[PDB]
């Protein structure tokens, strides 16, 4: 519940930044709006790629850290760790 | 082009719908991809004769759990 709320507020901020920044280039706006025009499943799929070190997702470090801590807690509760 | 750029993002969606989407995405991306190796250790534990002479076998050697 709170992870998704923070992610949605981030999307609010990032979309506004892209709208403010659309005026430099129309070609740039295409790759910036890939996310906002992707289906809702694809949007969250690309937002949840900060696992591993490829790290091309637009998620910020703090939001990444929240899930990277909850996931470690879940693993140590499942006994995998 | 503004209308084309205008679509259905996550920030407009109700929170519970996005939570369900997050549950599915988290599942597939993290829980499915998580890997831990235990097969060799498990088989080694299962193949051990578990203190059979200490146990009161009093006959033929009892088959191990893997058997």
Alpha helices in chain A (DSSP H): 2-21, 26-37, 40-47, 61-78
- Listed by the residue before each break, gaps in chain B with C–N over 2.5 Å are none
Q: Could you say which residues from 26 to 45 on chain A have a Cβ atom under 8 Å away from some Cβ of chain B?
A: 26, 29, 33, 35-37, 39-41, 43-45
A19/A26 Cα distance (integer angstroms): 11
B42 close to A (CB below 8 A): no
Counting one residue from A and one from B, how many pairs have CB atoms under 8 Å apart?
Answer: 68
Task: Indicate which technique resolved this structure.
Answer: cryo-EM
Do the Cβ atoms of A56 and A49 come closer than 8 Å?
A: yes
């Amino acid at each position: 519940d709170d992870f998704v709320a923070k992610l949605q507020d981030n999307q609010r901020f990032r979309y506004n930044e892209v709208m403010q920044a659309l005026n430099m280039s129309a070609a740039l706006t295409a790759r910036k709006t890939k996310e906002f025009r992707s289906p809702p499943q694809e949007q969250i799929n690309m937002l949840l790629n900060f696992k591993d070190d490829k790290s091309e997702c637009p998620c910020p470090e703090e939001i990444r850290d929240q899930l990277l801590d909850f996931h470690e807690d879940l693993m140590t509760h499942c006994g995998i760790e | 082009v503004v209308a084309c750029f205008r679509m259905a993002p996550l920030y407009n969606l109700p929170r519970h719908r996005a939570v369900n989407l997050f549950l599915q995405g988290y599942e597939k991306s993290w829980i499915e991809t998580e890997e831990h190796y235990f097969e060799d250790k498990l088989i080694e534990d299962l193949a051990k004769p578990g203190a059979e002479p200490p146990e009161e076998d009093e006959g033929t050697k009892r088959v191990d759990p893997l058997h």
